[PDB]
Amino acid sequence: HHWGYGKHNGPEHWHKDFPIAKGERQSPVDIDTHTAKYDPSLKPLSVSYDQATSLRILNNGHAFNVEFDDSQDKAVLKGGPLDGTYRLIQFHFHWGSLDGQGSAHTVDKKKYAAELHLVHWNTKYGDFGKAVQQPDGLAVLGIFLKVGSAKPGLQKVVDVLDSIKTKGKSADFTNFDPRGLLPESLDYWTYPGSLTTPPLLECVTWIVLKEPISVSSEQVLKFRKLNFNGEGEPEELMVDNWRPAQPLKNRQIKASFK
Numbered sequence: 001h002h003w004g005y006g007k008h009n010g011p012e013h014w015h016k017d018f019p020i021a022k023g024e025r026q027s028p029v030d031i032d033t034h035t036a037k038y039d040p041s042l043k044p045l046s047v048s049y050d051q052a053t054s055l056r057i058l059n060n061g062h063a064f065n066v067e068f069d070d071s072q073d074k075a076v077l078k079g080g081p082l083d084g085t086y087r088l089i090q091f092h093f094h095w096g097s098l099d100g101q102g103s104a105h106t107v108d109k110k111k112y113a114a115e116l117h118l119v120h121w122n123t124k125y126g127d128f129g130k131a132v133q134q135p136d137g138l139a140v141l142g143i144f145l146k147v148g149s150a151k152p153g154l155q156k157v158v159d160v161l162d163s164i165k166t167k168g169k170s171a172d173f174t175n176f177d178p179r180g181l182l183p184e185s186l187d188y189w190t191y192p193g194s195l196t197t198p199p200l201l202e203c204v205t206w207i208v209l210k211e212p213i214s215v216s217s218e219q220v221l222k223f224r225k226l227n228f229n230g231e232g233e234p235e236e237l238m239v240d241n242w243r244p245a246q247p248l249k250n251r252q253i254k255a256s257f258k
């Protein structure tokens with residue numbers, strides 16, 4: 001029927017509604033660290049989030065999105081493998097039912113507890129909906145989360161979850177600073193790919209940071225308390241909302257470091 005993460009509508013089924021699921025530049029992938037090519041021509045990333053304006057947090061039935069005002073160049077990504085400026089539109093996570101799984105990307109087959117996606121769209125295309133139709137329309141920064149110490153900067157997000165527990169719910173979420181979610185180092189791997197959830201459009205330049213951030217066990221526990229279902233529908237915990245690794249096919253993963 002309609003896509004999700006269960007046994008009957010899970011990733012294995014998406015191709016029937018989204019044929020691009022078996023495309024040539026699908027994501028996520030396993031990052032083989034000994035095959036990735038160091039490319040010294042890649043520039044350091046440039047993250048400009050000082051003027052970021054968060055607006056709202058929404059449970060869309062597959063994850064929770066924090067949305068930003070993208071009507072101007074307030075929170076932008078540039079540099080790295082990118083040509084042009086990409087504006088931040090939303091961030092969201094992928095996580096597991098257990099600490100040993102949850103990330104979309106894997107590193108030498110290692111799965112992390114979660115993966116943060118900061119989604120950016122290429123301003124040359126004028127709006128997000130036009131950008132998804134272009135091979136270089138989106139830039140997604142991916143950050144792995146491992147369970148260890150708490151991440152102070154994530155607590156504001158953890159605390160509002162109770163208020164968007166079910167699908168369709170939203171809450172005002174102003175003045176959140178996404179800079180509190182970055183690791184210390186901006187070293188990354190990059191490859192051409194796609195969105196990891198339907199519509200799976202192949203319009204993404206992935207920028208995967210090498211350094212994971214730490215979250216506490218309690219923090220991740222609160223994610224697992226969200227629901228996939230809408231209010232007054234049988235309870236389905238929002239867990240394991242990650243697509244498994246796809247074939248690399250004819251692609252090369254470049255590294256910004258050695």
Ligand SMILES: [Zn+2]
Pocket residue numbers: 092093094117196
């Ligand atoms: Zn994602």
